[PDB]
Amino acid sequence: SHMEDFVRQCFNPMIVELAEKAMKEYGEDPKIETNKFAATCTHLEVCFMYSDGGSKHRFEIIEGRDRIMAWTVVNSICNTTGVEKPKFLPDLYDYKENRFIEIGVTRREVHIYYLEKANKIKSEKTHIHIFSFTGEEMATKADYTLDEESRARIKTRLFTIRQEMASRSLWDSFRQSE
Ligand SMILES: [Mn+2]
Numbered sequence: 001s002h003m004e005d006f007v008r009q010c011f012n013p014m015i016v017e018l019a020e021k022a023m024k025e026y027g028e029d030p031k032i033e034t035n036k037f038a039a040t041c042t043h044l045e046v047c048f049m050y051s052d053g054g055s056k057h058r059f060e061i062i063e064g065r066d067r068i069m070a071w072t073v074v075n076s077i078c079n080t081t082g083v084e085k086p087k088f089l090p091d092l093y094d095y096k097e098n099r100f101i102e103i104g105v106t107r108r109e110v111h112i113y114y115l116e117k118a119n120k121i122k123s124e125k126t127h128i129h130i131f132s133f134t135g136e137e138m139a140t141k142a143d144y145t146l147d148e149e150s151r152a153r154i155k156t157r158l159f160t161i162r163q164e165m166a167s168r169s170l171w172d173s174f175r176q177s178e
């Protein structure tokens with residue numbers, strides 16, 4: 001398919017392999033559910049740009065690790081700091097603010113996905129931060145964790161990926177697939 005070739009020539013190889021591993025590891029094949037393949041790569045790259053923002057060792061990356069190793073690091077962070085173990089695996093831990101962070105990338109408005117994720121949490125201790133493909137963002141207690149410039153970089157990247165998909169006439173099915 002067109003989407004698979006585009007994902008491979010758009011994102012960096014480390015990201016593509018981690019996305020492939022994470023999808024097969026949960027029974028989905030990147031060569032078929034190509035829209036979910038693009039979205040796993042996007043979520044991965046956004047998470048890595050986020051963790052790059054801030055100081056050197058501010059964020060402990062949870063996403064991208066294998067399941068049991070990811071939970072190993074959460075349990076370790078929990079017994080280290082004293083925070084409660086979330087029931088669902090988050091994406092980061094903020095050592096500066098002492099909180100796990102769930103990062104989301106949606107194509108249906110910051111209000112809809114923020115509302116869904118906040119209801120999914122049902123344990124309000126986990127900080128939530130949503131980006132969209134339209135430049136908009138919404139975050140818990142309006143606390144956006146990073147400075148304006150890092151978030152603006154993430155947003156720019158998201159919009160460049162959106163235009164690249166449309167240039168290949170892939171954007172439409174991708175926006176309707178979420
Ligand atoms: Mn995740």
Ligand SMILES: [Mn+2]
Pocket residue numbers: 043091102103104
């Ligand atoms: Mn996430």
